[PDB]
Amino acid sequence: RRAPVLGSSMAYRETGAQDAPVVLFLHGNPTSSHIWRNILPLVSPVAHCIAPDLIGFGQSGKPDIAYRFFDHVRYLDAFIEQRGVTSAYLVAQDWGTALAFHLAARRPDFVRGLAFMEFIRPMPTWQDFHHTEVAEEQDHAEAARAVFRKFRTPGEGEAMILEANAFVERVLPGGIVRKLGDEEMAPYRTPFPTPESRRPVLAFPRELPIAGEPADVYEALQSAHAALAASSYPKLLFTGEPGALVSPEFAERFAASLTRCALIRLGAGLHYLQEDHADAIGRSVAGWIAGIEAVRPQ
Amino acid sequence: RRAPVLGSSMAYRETGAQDAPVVLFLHGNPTSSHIWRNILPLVSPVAHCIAPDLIGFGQSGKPDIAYRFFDHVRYLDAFIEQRGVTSAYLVAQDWGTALAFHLAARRPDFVRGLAFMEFIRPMPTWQDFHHTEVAEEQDHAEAARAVFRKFRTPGEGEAMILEANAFVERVLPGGIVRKLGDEEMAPYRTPFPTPESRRPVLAFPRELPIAGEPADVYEALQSAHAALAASSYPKLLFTGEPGALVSPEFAERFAASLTRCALIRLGAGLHYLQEDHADAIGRSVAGWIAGIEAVRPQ
Ligand SMILES: [Cl-]
Ligand SMILES: [Cl-]
């Protein structure tokens, strides 16, 4: 499906009933609603599932904008408005979680519950990016820091992401335990056939809140995380082992620090947890919605 | 662990933080808490899990009793009382569901929620045993009816179940889609080394509420089903295809007739759904409990 949004368009996948609660599925970099393809059918029995492609991603429009975090904020807000969604569960990964947290902070009453994984938080130092404390994960964590430092460097970032397509070709498969089939990988490639098309994919790592910068995003996410910590709505945190942005020991501590946040351990997993754990995530989210709906207002 | 119950004892598996809500896992014929072994670890993070072995099953005592449905009721009540459990979620399959429905009918305030599958219901005619409307299933359903009619026949039942051990050796593996490993099958055999020890296994099919008989169980399960249909507590129904006691079409209609009952389709499955869907069931139940607990007292 397609929705007109701010003079452009956003593509979205939709499934479920009509009178069911809405669940918005929010992808990150460099994915699209494609990543939820095997999860949607497991949640559709209990909810009206809506999975937008972020502006510049998947089958959405490609306007000549900056593709900064606040650009995605604006386009997602306009999409929510266009679709007439007045409240929803949020299910999110990667930059999807930053969008979810910021949305929940501004509109606390909108959120029925938040299910999240491999999420973004303000990172005081580069050592906080891919922070982990177990064996051969440090090789992988340090490399991830080196690659992302370069992504954030003028000229270098352009060469890696726009020219060499490294986020699609390396980082993505790098964050999935199993090897995708050709037919599963192809829809990740099709939105990005050219250097210019890859502008949003380069913009996102330059938005990551690291060592206080970019300051506008860093401050907004500090604020969003304060609101999350004070929030009362149901939460579900998924973690893989060793994970990427979120290590198991951190996940445990983080979930315990919040109000009403359950921790679900998935097993072997990196960044793109949906591709290795579609069944487990789908079944968990579906049970969770069913339980909340069974005791919610009525 | 072991608890003294009515002059005998019941074995039970226990896992999870003991300040968490309790979940009681109730197995049926001819199984034990063994059947939950791959589900417990998935529910443990959100609940204090208690999985008893029914009297005469698993590692429980083998007292000199009839092992009728109401013997199980009395022993399970006495177990719950001994453990000091004042409310619980219930997760149940087979005769476990009959005990669950009956407990819920008598003590609905005890029931935090009920997750169930392949459940027993009053069956007016033998055609309601393994009831199916699907052409290709009719042969299988008729074969099932033929064996259970024999189990219920004086003399013949004893030869099949006590002498030849057919419930353990044929019925159990017959209701699992995969083939259990030798190490997974062994603990299903060890409770039943002798014809004498198999008395509870023979008692159960003779308790099934078919064509009005035995009248006590039939009437109790008639009332319990009316209670279930009116009940307001959260419920989850799991189904397999084709299932055994519950067909997919029936599950759908049944779930829809209930209040606050979500339907979870597992895919290919017969009667002992835990052995084929441990991860899906565990993940769903854990999510459901997490969701209910997040919205409870507040
Ligand atoms: Cl990024
Ligand atoms: Cl039986």
From Swiss-Prot, chains A, B:
UniProt-annotated catalytic positions: D94, E118, H271
Catalysed reactions, as listed in the record: 1-haloalkane + H2O = a halide anion + a primary alcohol + H(+)
Subunit text: Monomer.
EC number(s) reported in the record: 3.8.1.5
Domain of life: Bacteria
Pfam families: Abhydrolase_1
HAMAP family in the record: Haloalk_dehal_type2
Function: Catalyzes hydrolytic cleavage of carbon-halogen bonds in halogenated aliphatic compounds, leading to the formation of the corresponding primary alcohols, halide ions and protons.
Stated family: Belongs to the haloalkane dehalogenase family. Type 2 subfamily.
Name under which the protein is recorded: Haloalkane dehalogenase
Taxonomic source organism: Bradyrhizobium diazoefficiens (strain JCM 10833 / BCRC 13528 / IAM 13628 / NBRC 14792 / USDA 110)
Domain annotation AB hydrolase-1: ranges: 21-131
NCBIfam families recorded: PRK03592.1
A GO MF label: hydrolase activity
Record's keyword terms, sorted: Hydrolase
InterPro entries xref list: AB_hydrolase_1 (IPR000073), AB_hydrolase_fold (IPR029058), AB_hydrolase_sf (IPR050266), Epox_hydrolase-like (IPR000639), Haloalkane_dehalogenase_2 (IPR023594)
